[PDB]
Amino acid sequence: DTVTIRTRKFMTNRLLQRKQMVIDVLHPGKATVPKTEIQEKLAKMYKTTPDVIFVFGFRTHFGGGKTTGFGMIYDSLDYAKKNEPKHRLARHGLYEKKKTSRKQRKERKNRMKKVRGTAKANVGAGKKPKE
């Protein structure tokens, strides 16, 4: 309600093909309308659709009535996918990282050391203990 997105520190970034900016959202008394709302709202300003817009940061300001965050708008989805930090993709789901996770890989790596050749053998050796 009664937001307005005011863009400090605007950057035309031609070499990562994106408009990079701070998002300053005034509110009447309660800090922060949704991240999804902000991407939609911003989307019709620069006319790029919200699906090439990512928004991150965000931290409510005491006594309400403001929230400063950060946004990026990619000219195309290809550009977004190519600068691409995993956490940014994660933030509103559409890709998340590995879920193997971690100690499975370490066990596997220790199995490979034992013998020379025979890939499949070491997989099966890692797989029998669950313990």
Binding site: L15, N83, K86
Partner: protein
């Protein structure tokens, strides 16, 4: 122990004039091996994402470099922590903007856009001028570029317009009294000025009496003086903060006056 050289450098142990933070990050970028020594260098990353702010992760920095949109000294680099130094020109080929690094007299590396005319060449002072093997002469510049068959009248502390299109010497400027110099390092960091007199002492360490533009006079060691061209004839412009020398009071007056007066 200590069984070999470190491949890491911690932050809060890196040189001040790179303008990194205190303890909010536990590792500094660290320069790669290259033509300049690591104290005076400025890793590519600090320029690219801390001054020009094109990345907010390290993941992006690697991805930027692999585009190969960045040439440094006319030649195509892809190193994440390139050891750029004094009067090294960075050429962004995607935007047509050439930036060179020269000290503020504050002591902070300047973001100093130059025209692509002035980014054709850089002036490099000779470090040694070498009679090489089989009686072929070479000059060697500070930035470790060896150019064979150099002009046959040159002598030490001359400057040399190196060209970056084609390499090699593209004339030279002779070392003489009253030449422009920028005094680099020490307590005389980033000051510009003439010479006046170079005092010679046999054995190690010879001091060069410098007078700056303001008319403040000081000496430094010859080592700390870098010749940047011919007297009263710049080849690149003065950077921000004067680049000469300014007092802490004057500097405060500028800081408060300009702020809340722009926009």
């Amino acid at each position: 122990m200590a069984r070999g050289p470190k491949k890491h450098l911690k932050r809060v142990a890196a040189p001040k004039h790179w303008m990194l933070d205190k303890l909010t990050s536990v590792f500094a970028p660290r320069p790669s091996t290259g033509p300049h020594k690591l104290r005076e260098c400025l890793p590519l990353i600090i320029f690219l994402r801390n001054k020009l702010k094109y990345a907010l992760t390290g993941d992006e920095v690697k991805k930027i470099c692999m585009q190969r949109f960045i040439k440094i000294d006319g030649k195509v680099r892809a190193d994440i922590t390139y050891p750029a130094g004094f009067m090294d020109v960075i050429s962004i080929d995607k935007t047509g903007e050439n930036f060179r690094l020269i000290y503020d007299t504050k002591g902070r590396f300047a973001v100093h856009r130059i025209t692509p005319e002035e980014a054709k060449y850089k002036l490099c002072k000779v470090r040694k001028i070498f009679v090489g093997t089989k009686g072929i002469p070479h000059l060697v510049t500070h930035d470790a570029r060896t150019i064979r068959y150099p002009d046959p009248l040159i002598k030490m502390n001359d400057t040399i317009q190196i060209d970056l299109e084609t390499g090699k010497i593209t004339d030279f400027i002779k070392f003489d009294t009253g030449n422009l110099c920028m005094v680099t390092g020490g307590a005389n960091l980033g000051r510009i000025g003439v010479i006046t007199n170079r005092e010679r002492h046999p054995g190690s360490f010879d001091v060069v009496h410098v007078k700056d533009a303001n008319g403040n006079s000081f000496a430094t060691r010859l080592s700390n003086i870098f010749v940047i061209g011919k007297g009263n004839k710049p080849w690149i412009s003065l950077p921000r903060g004067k680049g000469i020398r300014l007092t802490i009071a004057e500097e405060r007056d500028k800081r408060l006056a300009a702020k809340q007066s722009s926009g």
